[PDB]
Amino acid sequence: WKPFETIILLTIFANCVALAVYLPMPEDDNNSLNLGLEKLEYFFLTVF
Amino acid sequence: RRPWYIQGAASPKDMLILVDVSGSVSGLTLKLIRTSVSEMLETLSDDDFVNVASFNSNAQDVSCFQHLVQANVRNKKVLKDAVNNITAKGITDYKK
């Protein structure tokens, strides 16, 4: 009943922006930013 | 591009073409890199030495040569025929 409808929502909006900056590269290539987002995905999964 | 011009315009060289065959260069840019290497080798006389390595998270030579060869007709032909076989896959690592 606390402002919980503004933190998990804020986290979902911060996580839908961590999917737009992902850059898909042809047939198994990767830069640094994608390797960082792969980590941040663990944080997001654990918070959810 | 004539032999006499290229030989009178610069002293002999030890070129080492270094192709990036990682995944990002796949598609059109690889079709262009093949033609570019094959047109670059065409500017080498018999006093120049050349070898075409490639790298994608792991660097290695592209043919059965392993060192610098003398860039005559047959060696250039083998390097040309070995460049046209490369494919793009992997991660880019410039240090190796």
UniProtKB/Swiss-Prot annotation, chain A:
> Which tissue types show expression of this protein?
Detected in skeletal muscle T-tubules (at protein level).
The record describes its post-translational modification as: Phosphorylated. Phosphorylation by PKA activates the calcium channel. Both the minor and major forms are phosphorylated in vitro by PKA.
Glycosylated positions are 30
- Extracellular-side stretches of the chain, per the record, are 22-36
Q: Show the stretches that span the lipid bilayer.
A: 3-21
| Superkingdom of origin | Eukaryota
Q: Where in the cell is it found?
A: Cell membrane, Sarcolemma, T-tubule
Family according to the record = Belongs to the calcium channel alpha-1 subunit (TC 1.A.1.11) family. CACNA1S subfamily.
Entry's free-text remark on domains: Each of the four internal repeats contains five hydrophobic transmembrane segments (S1, S2, S3, S5, S6) and one positively charged transmembrane segment (S4). S4 segments probably represent the voltage-sensor and are characterized by a series of positively charged amino acids at every third position. The loop between repeats II and III interacts with the ryanodine receptor, and is therefore important for calcium release from the endoplasmic reticulum necessary for muscle contraction.
Q: What does this protein do?
A: Pore-forming, alpha-1S subunit of the voltage-gated calcium channel that gives rise to L-type calcium currents in skeletal muscle. Calcium channels containing the alpha-1S subunit play an important role in excitation-contraction coupling in skeletal muscle via their interaction with RYR1, which triggers Ca(2+) release from the sarcplasmic reticulum and ultimately results in muscle contraction. Long-lasting (L-type) calcium channels belong to the 'high-voltage activated' (HVA) group.
Q: Assembly and partners?
A: Component of a calcium channel complex consisting of a pore-forming alpha subunit (CACNA1S) and the ancillary subunits CACNB1 or CACNB2, CACNG1 and CACNA2D1. The channel complex contains alpha, beta, gamma and delta subunits in a 1:1:1:1 ratio, i.e. it contains either CACNB1 or CACNB2. CACNA1S channel activity is modulated by the auxiliary subunits (CACNB1 or CACNB2, CACNG1 and CACNA2D1). Interacts with DYSF and JSRP1. Interacts with RYR1. Interacts with STAC, STAC2 and STAC3 (via their SH3 domains). Interaction with STAC3 promotes expression at the cell membrane.
What's this protein's name?
Answer: Voltage-dependent L-type calcium channel subunit alpha-1S
User: What does the record give as the organism's lineage?
Assistant: Eukaryota, Metazoa, Chordata, Craniata, Vertebrata
Q: Give the shown range, full length included.
A: 50 to 97 of 1873
From Swiss-Prot, chain B:
Localization in the cell: Membrane; Cell membrane
Q: In which tissues is this gene expressed?
A: Skeletal muscle.
Q: How is it modified after translation?
A: Proteolytically processed into subunits alpha-2-1 and delta-1 that are disulfide-linked.
Q: Which residues are glycosylated?
A: 85
What residue intervals hold the motif MIDAS-like motif?
A: 20-24
So where does a divalent metal cation get bound?
A: 20, 22, 24
Q: Which family does it belong to?
A: Belongs to the calcium channel subunit alpha-2/delta family.
Q: In the UniProt entry, what is the domain comment?
A: The MIDAS-like motif in the VWFA domain binds divalent metal cations and is required to promote trafficking of the alpha-1 (CACNA1) subunit to the plasma membrane by an integrin-like switch.
Subunit-level organization:
Dimer formed of alpha-2-1 and delta-1 chains; disulfide-linked. Voltage-dependent calcium channels are multisubunit complexes, consisting of alpha-1 (CACNA1), alpha-2 (CACNA2D), beta (CACNB) and delta (CACNA2D) subunits in a 1:1:1:1 ratio.
More about this protein: Binds gabapentin, an antiepileptic drug.
Q: What does this protein do?
A: The alpha-2/delta subunit of voltage-dependent calcium channels regulates calcium current density and activation/inactivation kinetics of the calcium channel. Plays an important role in excitation-contraction coupling.
Write the protein's name.
Voltage-dependent calcium channel subunit alpha-2/delta-1
Q: Which organism is it from?
A: Oryctolagus cuniculus
Q: Which residues of the full protein are shown?
A: 242 to 337 of 1106
